[PDB]
Amino acid sequence: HMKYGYFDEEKKEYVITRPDTPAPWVNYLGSPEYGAIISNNAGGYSFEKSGANGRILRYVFNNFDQPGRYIYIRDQENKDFWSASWQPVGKPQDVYQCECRHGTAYTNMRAEYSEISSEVLYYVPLGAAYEVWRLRLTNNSDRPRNLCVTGYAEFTNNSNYEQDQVNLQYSQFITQTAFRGNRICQMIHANLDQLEPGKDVDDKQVTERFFGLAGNPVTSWCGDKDGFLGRYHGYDAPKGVIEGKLSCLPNYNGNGCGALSSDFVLKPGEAKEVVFVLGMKKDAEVEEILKRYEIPETVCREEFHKLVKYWHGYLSHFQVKTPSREFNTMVNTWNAYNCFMTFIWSRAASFIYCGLRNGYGYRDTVQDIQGIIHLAPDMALEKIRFMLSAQADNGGGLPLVKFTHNPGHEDTPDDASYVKETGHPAYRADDALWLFPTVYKYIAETGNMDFIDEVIPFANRGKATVYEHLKRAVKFSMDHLGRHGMPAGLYADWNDCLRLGKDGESTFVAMQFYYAMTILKKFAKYKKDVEYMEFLCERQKKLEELIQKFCWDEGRFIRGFTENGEIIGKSTDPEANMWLNPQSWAVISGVANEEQADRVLDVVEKRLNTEYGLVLMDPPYHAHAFDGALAVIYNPGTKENAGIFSQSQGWIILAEALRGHGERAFTYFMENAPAAQNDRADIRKLEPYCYGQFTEGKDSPNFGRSHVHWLTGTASTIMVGCVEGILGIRPDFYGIRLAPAIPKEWEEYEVEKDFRGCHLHIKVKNPGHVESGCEKLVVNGNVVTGSYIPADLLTEQTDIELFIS
Amino acid sequence: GSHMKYGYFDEEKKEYVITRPDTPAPWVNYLGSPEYGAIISNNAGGYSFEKSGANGRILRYVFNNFDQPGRYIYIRDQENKDFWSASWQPVGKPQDVYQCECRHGTAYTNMRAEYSEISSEVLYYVPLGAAYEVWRLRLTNNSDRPRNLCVTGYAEFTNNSNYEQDQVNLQYSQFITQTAFRGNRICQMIHANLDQLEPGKDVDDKQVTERFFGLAGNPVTSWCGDKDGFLGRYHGYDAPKGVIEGKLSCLPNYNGNGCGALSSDFVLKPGEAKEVVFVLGMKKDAEVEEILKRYEIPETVCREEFHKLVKYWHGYLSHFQVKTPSREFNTMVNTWNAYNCFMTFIWSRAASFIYCGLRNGYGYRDTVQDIQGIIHLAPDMALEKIRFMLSAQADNGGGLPLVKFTHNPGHEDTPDDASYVKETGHPAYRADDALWLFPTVYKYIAETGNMDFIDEVIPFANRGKATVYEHLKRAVKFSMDHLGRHGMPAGLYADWNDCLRLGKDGESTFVAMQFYYAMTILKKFAKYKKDVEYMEFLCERQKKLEELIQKFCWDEGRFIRGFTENGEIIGKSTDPEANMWLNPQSWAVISGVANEEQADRVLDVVEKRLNTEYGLVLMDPPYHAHAFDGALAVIYNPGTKENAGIFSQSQGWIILAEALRGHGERAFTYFMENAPAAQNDRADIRKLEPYCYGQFTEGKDSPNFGRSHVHWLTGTASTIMVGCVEGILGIRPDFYGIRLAPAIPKEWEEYEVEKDFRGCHLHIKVKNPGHVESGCEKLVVNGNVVTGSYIPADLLTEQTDIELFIS
Numbered sequence A: 001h002m003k004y005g006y007f008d009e010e011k012k013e014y015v016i017t018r019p020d021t022p023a024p025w026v027n028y029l030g031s032p033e034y035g036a037i038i039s040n041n042a043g044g045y046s047f048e049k050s051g052a053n054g055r056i057l058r059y060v061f062n063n064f065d066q067p068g069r070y071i072y073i074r075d076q077e078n079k080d081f082w083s084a085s086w087q088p089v090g091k092p093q094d095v096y097q098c099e100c101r102h103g104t105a106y107t108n109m110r111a112e113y114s115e116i117s118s119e120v121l122y123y124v125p126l127g128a129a130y131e132v133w134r135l136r137l138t139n140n141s142d143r144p145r146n147l148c149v150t151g152y153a154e155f156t157n158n159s160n161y162e163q164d165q166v167n168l169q170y171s172q173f174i175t176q177t178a179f180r181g182n183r184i185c186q187m188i189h190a191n192l193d194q195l196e197p198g199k200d201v202d203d204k205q206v207t208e209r210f211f212g213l214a215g216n217p218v219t220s221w222c223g224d225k226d227g228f229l230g231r232y233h234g235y236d237a238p239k240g241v242i243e244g245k246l247s248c249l250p251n252y253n254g255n256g257c258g259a260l261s262s263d264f265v266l267k268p269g270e271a272k273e274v275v276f277v278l279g280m281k282k283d284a285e286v287e288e289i290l291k292r293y294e295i296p297e298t299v300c301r302e303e304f305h306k307l308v309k310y311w312h313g314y315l316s317h318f319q320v321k322t323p324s325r326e327f328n329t330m331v332n333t334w335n336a337y338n339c340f341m342t343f344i345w346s347r348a349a350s351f352i353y354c355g356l357r358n359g360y361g362y363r364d365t366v367q368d369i370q371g372i373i374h375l376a377p378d379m380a381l382e383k384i385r386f387m388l389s390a391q392a393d394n395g396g397g398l399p400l401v402k403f404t405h406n407p408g409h410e411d412t413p414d415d416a417s418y419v420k421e422t423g424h425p426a427y428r429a430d431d432a433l434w435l436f437p438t439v440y441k442y443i444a445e446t447g448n449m450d451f452i453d454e455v456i457p458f459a460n461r462g463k464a465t466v467y468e469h470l471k472r473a474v475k476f477s478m479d480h481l482g483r484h485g486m487p488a489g490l491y492a493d494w495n496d497c498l499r500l501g502k503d504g505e506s507t508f509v510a511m512q513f514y515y516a517m518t519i520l521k522k523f524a525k526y527k528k529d530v531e532y533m534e535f536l537c538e539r540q541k542k543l544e545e546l547i548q549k550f551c552w553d554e555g556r557f558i559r560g561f562t563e564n565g566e567i568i569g570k571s572t573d574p575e576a577n578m579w580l581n582p583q584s585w586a587v588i589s590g591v592a593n594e595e596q597a598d599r600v601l602d603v604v605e606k607r608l609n610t611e612y613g614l615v616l617m618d619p620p621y622h623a624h625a626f627d628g629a630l631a632v633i634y635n636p637g638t639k640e641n642a643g644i645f646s647q648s649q650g651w652i653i654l655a656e657a658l659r660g661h662g663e664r665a666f667t668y669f670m671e672n673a674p675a676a677q678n679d680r681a682d683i684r685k686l687e688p689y690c691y692g693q694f695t696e697g698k699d700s701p702n703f704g705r706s707h708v709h710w711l712t713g714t715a716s717t718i719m720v721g722c723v724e725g726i727l728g729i730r731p732d733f734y735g736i737r738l739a740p741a742i743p744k745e746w747e748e749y750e751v752e753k754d755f756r757g758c759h760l761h762i763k764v765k766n767p768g769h770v771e772s773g774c775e776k777l778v779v780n781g782n783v784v785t786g787s788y789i790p791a792d793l794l795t796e797q798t799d800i801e802l803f804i805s
Numbered sequence B: 001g002s003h004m005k006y007g008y009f010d011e012e013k014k015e016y017v018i019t020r021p022d023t024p025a026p027w028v029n030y031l032g033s034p035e036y037g038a039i040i041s042n043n044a045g046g047y048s049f050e051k052s053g054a055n056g057r058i059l060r061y062v063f064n065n066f067d068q069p070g071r072y073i074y075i076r077d078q079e080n081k082d083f084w085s086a087s088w089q090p091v092g093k094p095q096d097v098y099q100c101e102c103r104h105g106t107a108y109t110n111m112r113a114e115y116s117e118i119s120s121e122v123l124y125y126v127p128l129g130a131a132y133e134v135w136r137l138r139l140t141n142n143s144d145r146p147r148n149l150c151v152t153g154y155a156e157f158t159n160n161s162n163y164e165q166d167q168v169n170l171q172y173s174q175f176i177t178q179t180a181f182r183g184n185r186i187c188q189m190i191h192a193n194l195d196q197l198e199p200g201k202d203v204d205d206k207q208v209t210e211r212f213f214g215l216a217g218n219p220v221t222s223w224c225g226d227k228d229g230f231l232g233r234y235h236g237y238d239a240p241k242g243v244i245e246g247k248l249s250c251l252p253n254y255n256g257n258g259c260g261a262l263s264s265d266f267v268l269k270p271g272e273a274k275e276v277v278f279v280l281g282m283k284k285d286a287e288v289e290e291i292l293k294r295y296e297i298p299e300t301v302c303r304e305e306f307h308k309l310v311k312y313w314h315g316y317l318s319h320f321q322v323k324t325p326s327r328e329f330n331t332m333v334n335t336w337n338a339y340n341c342f343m344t345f346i347w348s349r350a351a352s353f354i355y356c357g358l359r360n361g362y363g364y365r366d367t368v369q370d371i372q373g374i375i376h377l378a379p380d381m382a383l384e385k386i387r388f389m390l391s392a393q394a395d396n397g398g399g400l401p402l403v404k405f406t407h408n409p410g411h412e413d414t415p416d417d418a419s420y421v422k423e424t425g426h427p428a429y430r431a432d433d434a435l436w437l438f439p440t441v442y443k444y445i446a447e448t449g450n451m452d453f454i455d456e457v458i459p460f461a462n463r464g465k466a467t468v469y470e471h472l473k474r475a476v477k478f479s480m481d482h483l484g485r486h487g488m489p490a491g492l493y494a495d496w497n498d499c500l501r502l503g504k505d506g507e508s509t510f511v512a513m514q515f516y517y518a519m520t521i522l523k524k525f526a527k528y529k530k531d532v533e534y535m536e537f538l539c540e541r542q543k544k545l546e547e548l549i550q551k552f553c554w555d556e557g558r559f560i561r562g563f564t565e566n567g568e569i570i571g572k573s574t575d576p577e578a579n580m581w582l583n584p585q586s587w588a589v590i591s592g593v594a595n596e597e598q599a600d601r602v603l604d605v606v607e608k609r610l611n612t613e614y615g616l617v618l619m620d621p622p623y624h625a626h627a628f629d630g631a632l633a634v635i636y637n638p639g640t641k642e643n644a645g646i647f648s649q650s651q652g653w654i655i656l657a658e659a660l661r662g663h664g665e666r667a668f669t670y671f672m673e674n675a676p677a678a679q680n681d682r683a684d685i686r687k688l689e690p691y692c693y694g695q696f697t698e699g700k701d702s703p704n705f706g707r708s709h710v711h712w713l714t715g716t717a718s719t720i721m722v723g724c725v726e727g728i729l730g731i732r733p734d735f736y737g738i739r740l741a742p743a744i745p746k747e748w749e750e751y752e753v754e755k756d757f758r759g760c761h762l763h764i765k766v767k768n769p770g771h772v773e774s775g776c777e778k779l780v781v782n783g784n785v786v787t788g789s790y791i792p793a794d795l796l797t798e799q800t801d802i803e804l805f806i807s
């Protein structure tokens, strides 16, 4: 086909062999503290703390993927020049070979042209607040070559995107650049250099960005973008590159830049390594950083090894070997890396997310925790502590958790100050409920029973044990019930576009509530809280009766009730008569029995499944959308309007695997697997190595096209569907149950899992070629009845053999 | 070729002719009005909008970059597959085989190009009163063989009229638009899926909105509504795939970035010319059909609409025309300063290539000052805007710092209200806003003689109502209710200078001189109104205020900038930085606080200290290492903006000052240093448009000394126009006549002025045989010698012949 790359499972890299990808395929470097997003054509931007308020490099979104981290190589013999990435020069691909390897927190750009080879390793060193472009030049010709390498970085005039892009009458007149031997220093508010140390004028001081070169002397420089590009020149042919010598002039007002040129004389077969460094540091620290890279080869290889060791070591705590190559690729590397990305970066910055953020969405962060629970349990513990501290003392979760979250002193949606500050006017019905699968899955993963009694403060006032925090969430749900005795809709639930009214009732939320009571029943059993346990039993019985009475329809559960009495999701409605999430969570929560779960899954597959996944609902909204059906503003088959919402794909997968339906769970995973779409990139457009937010549904002419890369809730739910669901990795408080749901073709597979200080080597065998089962279980050579391995049986190296047929 | 580097002024057509397209910056022109506006560069770049530049944007534009996208027209030769653009960019053909010329006129832009013996002429304009724009293309085959050409128009729509929704909230706006082909046009639907909503209903305060791009005068042969489909992967506007292949995809956009691409086939015989029309706007299909039908045979209708536009704007300009030996002065006063004043009066500071954000109202001092630039051209417009601004005055007499677009007199809030501060973002009153009414209103009444307007009752902003005379009384009372410690007006929030924070209890010399001049103007009004008690009040407090000014502000041959609320003296001759400010001396001369010899000292020192080749700096030395807490200008680079830059609005004042004292040589040289026309031969240094004014010029303390910034929409046009008309030319009317006291350069032997005044056309003939700056040797009105330099209104006939002898 027109394949653009393949997966290197040895190096854990996606290698792009053809550079004219259907979209900019990007990778992330560093962390939110210092982050760099880079495309396969070197485009992107860098920032500190905030993508839109701490932006170091200018980037024009929704355009040509420009500017970027450009490295030009010019042959002094024939004045020809090209770029280390295909763009911006865009040489013909019959004479210009190149490849772009995206790895964990690094990107390697190889290119061969005119018998000259270049390799640029872009990375942010582990724990560093700057970025490195390590260029290795190699002469492959039989003659000496004279080359001129030019690095280009386009600074912002202000860290704030609005000041740099909109307030031109101010930001065009505050910057200066200066050359300092081996670097260009850009000064924002340059004229404030004479202020007494610590003082400020109009809440502004001099800030400094830098662009330096180490490993070779600088032969010419330029700090003025226009002077570097030339009048009416694009990045494909900069004047300063064309002429073979930069202006050696700075910028004074206008648009600054970092442009450094360096001459190379390479013998036949000779290679040389240099580094470009970019960041937001003061002069002395920059001089130290540049001195560190004087001879770059060894230090750069050591930093690269440290990066790989860190990220691959986190990945190594769970590795699978199954007959499905796409499944292996996603579970072992790319889904896990994506889960770490969503856990660490939240929704801070991408090529779609480019504005300001006030804080962390509650349900988003809580759910993102689940993706990395089996990989970085201490990280998950700290994030769970944080999110529990973001719960108000009424049990509800703060819809927006401020970056300056200060437990014991925060305001809530019940305060006008919080609404004015965050922009979230009310509590949402579903937020706190997500705490139940998350917290449980953490405690089941680690056996950290003590955490149940750990005292954590509430957001506004008071403190409670984790157990009491969950009880307060349940109380919040019970303190806000609708007219059918089911949880009131409040502002909204998981679906931002489904406004049922504050007195409506969402079936999604009702099933979340039922599942929360199941989890809390487990907790109360451990705590010997008998009175609360019988309370939970009675409330769960009542809620199950209510759900079956008012939400069960024609082989399906309805979507919910509006506050005006309307029934959303009824089978006879002309539009949106079949919804995915109610059935997914009927199976997940256990509200549906065995036959009911099978029936709703059958109807889901028949009505909602497509080649690229399951649509959120069907038919799309258009001519019969009620007052709160906000999704109707979107094009059909797009976003919440009957799009294939990728996050929901996780839930249904898990649901299918909870019923032992290995064939359907794996089919859904494959339909949504980006690796499985590597041969259909042109339809998918989006990166084949990370998850997007949604795929355009069947009701769109662009069926199969994915949007919003990397930073979505999809990574976590699909990771859970793969690990907890398909692979049957189902721990509880006192051990781990193995109940896989796999495709029948799999004869056997292996799992290496770190679990409670022990390494589990698991061989699952399926000689009968079934979907699920439990014929034999052998733990350390001893047969164990059932499919459950108590923690008492675990040794430092535990061999497990599970025959499912 | 510095002599006429990139263009020249065509004073017969009243246009600027750009003969070389690689200009140092995008040189833009304005079409339409804020109702429907379109800003267009000499390479067709820019954007169009309805009502608001950033909340009603129709075409996407990437600012501070490559002047892209734009209103692009591609012509492709079907025989050899070669193509070019009607503007130089985006194709950018080599200029040795591609000739072109961009004529910017009053509310129209004409782009001529010749390539491969094919001539193209695109006339861009918004018809008078219309809410759409027209790109009329005329193609002429100058070769001796038949030519088959394919013309493609391209328009890049926004996905949402709000810039933040279209540029930032991509995860929302990338999934709400669709395009549809309808025979001769492409219709773009924002929130398209809302097409089947019940009558009048909306979803999330949203309904379908429609934009259109149509072609009339030739059949559409192919089309494309998807930007990515039109350009192609990794293609720029220089070579769209749809243009390269000679046929568009005929596919719409569905999500993503839509566009309007229309390709039409032409077969031109040798010497045959054909005219077609592209139309763009934000209207529904039913109206678009009629609009397109109107341009079926477009030559005559387009010529008629062009004639209407030219007649309108040139007829507003014709009310004042000068004939002086200075070509640059003629070009500025007759055409480009006047056109600029109309632009600033109508568009305020709504939108440009620098102003691309949201506006929530009008600045008080800005609007009131902008009124002055058109008083001698459109007096009824000035009256309407003065009425509005007086209705924008509050109870206490101070002006609202920002006048809302929904300004409702009698029901508005004030800076003393929390709702106003939350809504407009201005927390306190400014000390100078209302004072600007006094030079404005007077100059209107002096121009028209509309005495009844003094009686006209106009409501206040929050509550109550009063006559215009009582409005100025309330302004003086407001300035009298907020005095400082030296008996002068308190600083309040700020004065004209945005970067000089003297504190609410400080005292700015600028405001004190403004208050003195306001007192003089109100004294004239009280004399007309026989308010002798108020006249004694005015004389008394005026003598007092002058005493305090001269006691507390006079320094070493200069007036200080003011006092901070902590006691610091700003502008003291002994201060290491900013020891000499321009505006205090300018307004010492203007308000009459300084006497004759004192005005001479202050003007001498401002020349010696602040004058540069490109105008006078705001102050000197620049702030850097000796800035006080409120010297906010220190954040800007030296010689830039308010930090000792050549602020172009202040020039108009100093010119006027030098003209009020009769210093013709100094005033004319101060004009020449700032005249954009006079810098046409130094465009590479100026960068900015040589036919319109900017906000400031980089001062001597900057390595880019002489570069101007922020084009078109500034306060400079009005004040420099007043310095040229009321100042240099001496056109100084009062309540009952007109005085002619010109301050011209001694080199001028004789000049003429045609001015409409009080429903009468005055043909003024000034003679200066002694080569002097100013004077009054003889005055003849209609063949009868009149004493002095004054012409009472009863001497004015329908055709009034005036002959003045300066020497």
Ligand SMILES: [Cl-]
Pocket (backbone or CB within 6 Å): A495, A508, A579, A581, A616
């Ligand atoms: Cl849903």
Ligand SMILES: [Cl-]
Pocket (backbone or CB within 6 Å): B497, B510, B581, B583, B618
């Ligand atoms: Cl000033």
